[PDB]
Ligand binder design. Sequence first.
Ligand code: EL5
Ligand code: EL5
Ligand code: CL
Ligand code: CL
Lengths: 484, 484
Amino acid sequence: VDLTNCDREPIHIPGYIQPHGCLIACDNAMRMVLRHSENCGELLGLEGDLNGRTAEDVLGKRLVHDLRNALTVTRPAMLPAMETSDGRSFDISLHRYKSTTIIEFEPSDSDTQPLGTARKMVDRIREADSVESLISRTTRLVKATLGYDRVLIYRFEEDGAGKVVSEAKQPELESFLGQYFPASDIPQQARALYLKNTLRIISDASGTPIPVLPAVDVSGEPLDLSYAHLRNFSPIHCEYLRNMGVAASMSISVIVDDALWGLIVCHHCSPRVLSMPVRIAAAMFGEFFSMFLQVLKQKRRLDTINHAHAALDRFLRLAAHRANLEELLVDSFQDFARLIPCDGVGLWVGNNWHGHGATPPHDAIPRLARFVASVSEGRVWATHALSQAIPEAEIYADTAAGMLAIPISQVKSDYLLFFRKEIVQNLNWKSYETGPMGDRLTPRKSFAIWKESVRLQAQPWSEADREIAETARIALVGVAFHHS
Amino acid sequence: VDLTNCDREPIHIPGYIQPHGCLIACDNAMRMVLRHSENCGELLGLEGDLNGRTAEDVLGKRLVHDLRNALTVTRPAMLPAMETSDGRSFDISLHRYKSTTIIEFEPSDSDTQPLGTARKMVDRIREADSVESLISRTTRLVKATLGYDRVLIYRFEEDGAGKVVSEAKQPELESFLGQYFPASDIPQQARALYLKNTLRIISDASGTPIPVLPAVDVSGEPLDLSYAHLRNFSPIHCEYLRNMGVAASMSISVIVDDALWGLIVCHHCSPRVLSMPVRIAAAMFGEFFSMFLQVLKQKRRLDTINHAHAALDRFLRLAAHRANLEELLVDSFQDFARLIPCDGVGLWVGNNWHGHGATPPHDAIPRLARFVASVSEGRVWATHALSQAIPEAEIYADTAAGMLAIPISQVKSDYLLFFRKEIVQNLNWKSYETGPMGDRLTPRKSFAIWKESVRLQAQPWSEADREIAETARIALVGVAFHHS
Ligand SMILES: *C/C=C1/C(=C/C2=NC(=C\c3[nH]c(/C=C4\NC(=O)C(C=C)=C4C)c(C)c3CCC(=O)O)/C(CCC(=O)O)=C2C)NC(=O)C1C
Ligand SMILES: *C/C=C1/C(=C/C2=NC(=C\c3[nH]c(/C=C4\NC(=O)C(C=C)=C4C)c(C)c3CCC(=O)O)/C(CCC(=O)O)=C2C)NC(=O)C1C
Ligand SMILES: [Cl-]
Ligand SMILES: [Cl-]
């Protein structure tokens, strides 16, 4: 495994598990054992090879009656504090995928209440009245409740890149708040797993991984550990964590509108297992956090569009009380900066330019106005990478790297131009020992690679930005026709 | 051409034009004439064959200088009252498609002002404050201004079917208001044309079509008349109009969010040509009608979701002041009918049923509740065709043909159920002589075929309906967790 085509590694079939539990694979109808982990013996107390031997034999008829009963009810069923034929107590994660029954065993924890812990946490977030307020309080809350050394919220940008939008940490540790990371740092097959396995744990990044027997069966097939919580993680990621001085992790998938919005990511500096009941509670908390964020995002989109409609209605009331519409636009145009987040706004009317805020230089505008007129086709036009459309625009990218243009006339070539500075201008942001695979696996190199990937580019225009621009196009084109 | 697989007929390459003008096809760079209409001679005054002869020869160097000048500026350029070498006056529709220049000639009309007519009309719709108010006033306005005998607005449903949502007509004519028509009555290749050619005219449905020479050239290629306003229409449609007693038509394409929302359709009982300047004005009017409807649709979606959020906030304030949540739901559930348009609503809580309005019978509910629990997977579930999911549900389809189910608990199998009657129950709706191809081509048979196609089906659940159900799911599941 080498660090070039990152999306290639099959992380779902590594043929190893983590040492904090043992795994037993059986046939579809759980009749007999097909595969098992090397540490099955040491933990369950059993001796010799377990493969071929029937299910009723290995675990006892008492236990299998309950396991087979539960499989009749792809989501893993979680049965805590089960009695084995020996008399030992285990927590059991049971699931079925690709017609293979998988049974995960871990030492029991009986002195926790899942729904109790979950409710207490969900109660403290349910009253949050903004995305910012939910995000900020969640990092603190999760840290105080699950006692991890650092808790991040990692939000995915449009281009797959990740931003650290919230942080709770021990004072001694370094901050990642406001730092970005490349799309490659979390490959595509990883995001696929995270969309179907909502909670993930690494107990010990420096632990010895326990191999599954057999790795490949008669048919040449590997064991798919997609929904298995004991699945061992890519050595690339584990080397990354080791270099960061992180011994353990727990991540929660944030699903909004059926898409992976981001991760709640917990780091610990010493090894750390969460017991099944604590994991159940944290997963409940994750589902509610996702649901509340979704509603809060919907409410913010509504408020943004409502505000734009009120703004435009105010302007249309003025426009009907003023003879010269061109005069009004020259006086008013900067006010349109309240509709769409921009670093500068400009009016191009009757081959005259009027600027406000961060705009390209006066001499550069006519080239830009001519270009827009050619590709616009009387529709809204927007790029976050201006230099890719006009190479000479590279020189003023620090001032204006992104442009959204609104036609304000049905007939004449007049435009309302919104600009954004290049994304590195708007940034509001230590030494790391490396492993065998080099200094690529450090937050320092990741952030430097991202910085390069976004050179001469602005924050992209959202759907909400484009929807408002379009409503503003119909408003200005409409009132322009009235006057003529 | 026979009436089975309707989407098959190539209406874009019929090799004929309408008699109210003449057509001349030239090469990409308009050097010489490749094709021409049989009536080119009679109208332009020219004698013999025009194919092969150079452009400069046929029209004169004076005219071609202006035509070639205009082609340098896929949208057809419209040049009214042009002087031919003879001295006659013609209105010229010039366009270029598939590297073939097409020139359309019609006798001139100089005693109209396009922008004047357009502004007067656009001024009367620009202040409309609801979709209903824009739709209703537009049919009357277009009838009074363009003097057509009947003006319809034909709105496309989700399944391609069309509904007559507005009508202005002569008293003597019969009404189509509230009638539906099958998706097949306007085939797919037709809707494709209408998305790129926004205005269409039939001068005379009983007129003799003029053939293009040659129909097929050396390469075996036909002349594509997609953007040509003289293109002759399918004889299926023309037979339809003849059976309706309609001699002429003019349709305007209504584009909303870059999709064909429907048509403004004008019928005349006598033959009728609209002059180029009148067509320009009507096309301007069509663009503004589309733009205003789009904004009004956006504003109505906003108001609907805002109202749902206020409703849910009111309910959450009550829920925090009441110990028994199940009591509150039993008292309150009918009020949820204000969120989503429904004919009935029901509560399934603790294996007890409470109904309100048009719901399935008491004895039928547990079967339905068991079914929903199996397919729901804790997500919102909705069908407009209940009998297709549960065959025995056919018997009560007149009362409840459609169902949307909201889970109200994270743990228990409790549901808020919304129902809709079958669409023919909610309907609020003469003899026709037929032609060679039978009685299929009559509004009577079309409406009867549609009625059959929607048997045992309700009005489908919109995106707005599903978005509100989802927000209500998160609200009820969220407050349910709080109580436990
Ligand atoms: C070429 C391959 C690379 C790569 C692959 C990779 N990353 C994976 C997981 C993963 N990566 C991150 C990244 C960070 N977490 C942090 O806290 C920081 C801090 C600066 C970074 C940059 C995260 C959060 C995750 C997910 C962790 C989790 O879910 O617990 C994986 C998948 C691991 C698996 O087996 O499931 C792969 C593969 N990462 C690289 O940087 C590179 C070059
Ligand atoms: C199997 C083929 C059929 C068919 C084909 C067809 N229809 C076309 C156009 C068209 N059809 C309608 C329908 C109506 N208009 C009305 O006013 C009423 C009133 C009750 C009906 C049912 C309309 C509006 C149009 C468009 C008219 C226009 O744009 O002016 C076409 C395309 C015609 C063309 O060459 O562009 C085709 C093909 N219609 C059938 O009913 C059937 C069975
Ligand atoms: Cl301000
Ligand atoms: Cl009411």
